[PDB]
Design a binder for this molecule. Sequence first.
Ligand SMILES: C=C(C(=O)O)[C@@H]1OB(O)c2ccccc21
Length: 241
Amino acid sequence: WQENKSWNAHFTEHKSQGVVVLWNENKQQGFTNNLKRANQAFLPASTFKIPNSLIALDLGVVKDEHQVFKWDGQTRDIATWNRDHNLITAMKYSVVPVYQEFARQIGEARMSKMLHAFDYGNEDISGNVDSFWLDGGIRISATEQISFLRKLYHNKLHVSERSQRIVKQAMLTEANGDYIIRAKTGYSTRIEPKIGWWVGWVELDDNVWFFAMNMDMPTSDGLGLRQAITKEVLKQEKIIP
Ligand SMILES: C=C(C(=O)O)[C@@H]1OB(O)c2ccccc21
């Protein structure tokens, strides 16, 4: 692991504080601007949608990426949530109430066993079965997110290959002729400190760069900084143009 404090300039530029962690898969080398915060464990918030999706698929709670989960008719503050969703759009718009129903159907015993099998964070699901990743006991650091994502990339988690392929499809965020980004955002607001997350990886022709970032996020107005700061780091390190 190497520390590169120069990336702090990207946070300071936006009056922010946080951490970016990168992992060069070919060379098995990690880089970060803050080795302490890189290993600080936070609520995963919606980044938990990655393991939750895997478990739901593997237990048949979700049949496939086309199955429709009908809106329950309750109007919520995020407009995109007030409609029917499949796994692809529920990941895209981070639709909490769809995933809350998954978790209830999964149930606490199976949720706990799967997170242990995944070696996920502190493996603690204390709290409500349908909100613990938002206001319960589960904590994961940026470097632990990378360990988890690497197993997913390699199809090494303790679920079927199909489940892992479908979730990686549903993580698709950006692609062009230079790179592919598979990732998931998160925003933890229920418990302090409020933080934003972005975790995933960048696929190149001949390498994969895993990343996990979090940043202090006192208001929703800075959420776009999650991707913008990560991309400034990726550009500085010549991973993306
Ligand atoms: C949409 C979100 C994002 O882009 O990060 C966010 O995901 B969750 O952490 C989450 C939970 C409740 C409300 C919003 C969110």
